[PDB]
């Protein structure tokens, strides 16, 4: 048989009939629920830590495990990804992957409204998450071998990979729309980032599935390493608790908000380029080969820190990345229609929010906007909520439905145009006024609700503007003219660029 089939009792029987007949040692295995699959991943140190203090017994235990047919690499899992080709994962990663909490990412489109503009962009967060995990693994491995002095362990690598996998665990329906348009609009009081949901959901993930114990059985130390994983996704002498300042560079792998060069961006750049029909000048494998840790000293008392660094002449590669970054941002991300669709879906959700029930832990009812507060409710919240509203028989959603039917039948708000501020920019406070200003600026009455104003912000590494779009809801010609000239006058009045 396989060790995969073996229960802990089976392992106990195997241990007994091989000579380990002592009940406490058997109790170790029963207690820690060490199913067969773990056996080829056990260490001298692990057997020590689990609690066999016999310096010679441990060796022979591992010998017995080695005698068996199935080994370590016999239990890895291989994905076929079109971006990365073949992909090996250590079984723990699969165990994390194979949960409701994670699998839910199959049902959230990466580009959200994008899919309704770019029919190629059907890809979801799931596969992207896989990709990020894999790349994280790759970069950390490369740095590990190239500089063995760095003391980078299996544990670290796995933590980095898990951080990779779970960086997007907490995205809501339609990805950035949810955390970027809907929640801020529906819960202005709460400051919420999909990362927040990511760490909360990871915490939910390990707990719903009792993987703390499994993580221990595979050689992680849950207390430290979960904090490490969480901190990698989230962020903040040395602030982090997960790892010592000596291994600071590890925090630059998965999320590097400092200079915007991380494996997340690598994967989604490549993938979005793949599905949108854009060809990507940036070879990340080149980056990984020429990636090294080395020390930097900046005087603030002088600080000394280990950053990820690239050979100075590999600057051209970054020029390629940032081109692709701009290329995607211009063409796809800040796309005037995609955003319109995001806006309309948000609107529908806002109008659907009061009536739609979603049950969480203990079956407590939650609204779409409040599901983020309960992971077991949020676990059920996916893109499909789009159809659930659309198909609902409840007549209180008829308003919400009609918006969704309009998205389906391409009856969208009319895009009046884009504008740019000549000087200064617009205060985050000043936003909610804007639809009123446009409405009241005169060149038929046009109420403030008839307009949406969409503000968009355009936006280092070490070696060894504002766009305003105005949409009008009223779709008739005369209202369209009126709104157009309203918008022109508003632009002229605030001394903005003459519209597109
Ligand atoms: Mg991501």
Author numbering: 72 to 307, 316 to 379, 385 to 527, 533 to 548, 559 to 563, 589 to 624
Question: Could you give the paper's own sentences about this structure?
Answer:
The sterile alpha-motif (SAM) and histidine-aspartate (HD) domain-containing protein 1 (SAMHD1) is a dNTP phosphohydrolase that restricts viral replication by limiting the cellular dNTP pool. The active tetramer form of SAMHD1 is induced by cellular nucleotides, which bind two allosteric sites of each subunit. The SAM domain is not required for dNTP hydrolysis and viral restriction by hSAMHD1, but is essential for these activities of mSAMHD1. To better understand the regulatory role of the SAM domain, we crystallized full-length mSAMHD1 in three different states (0, 1, and 2 allosteric nucleotides bound).
In addition to the 2-Allo structure, we also captured crystal structures of full-length mSAMHD1 in two more activation intermediate states: no allosteric nucleotides bound (No-Allo) and one allosteric nucleotide bound to Allo-site 1 only (1-Allo). The No-Allo crystal was obtained without the addition of nucleotides in the crystallization mixture and diffracted to 3.5 Å resolution. The 1-Allo crystal was crystallized with dGTP-α-S in the crystallization mixture and diffracted to 3.4 Å resolution. The No-Allo and 1-Allo mSAMHD1 structures also crystallized as tetramers in different space groups (C2 and P21212) with 4 or 2 copies of mSAMHD1 in the asymmetric unit, respectively. Our No-Allo and 1-Allo structures show that these inactive tetramer intermediates are composed of two relatively rigid dimers with loose tetramer interfaces. Although mSAMHD1 is capable of forming tetramers without nucleotides bound to Allo-site 2, these states are inactive and likely represent activation intermediates of the enzyme. In the absence of nucleotides, mSAMHD1 exists in an equilibrium between stable dimers and inactive tetramers. Starting from the most open No-Allo state, dimer A′ swings progressively toward dimer A via the 1-Allo-state to close the tetramer interface in the 2-Allo state.
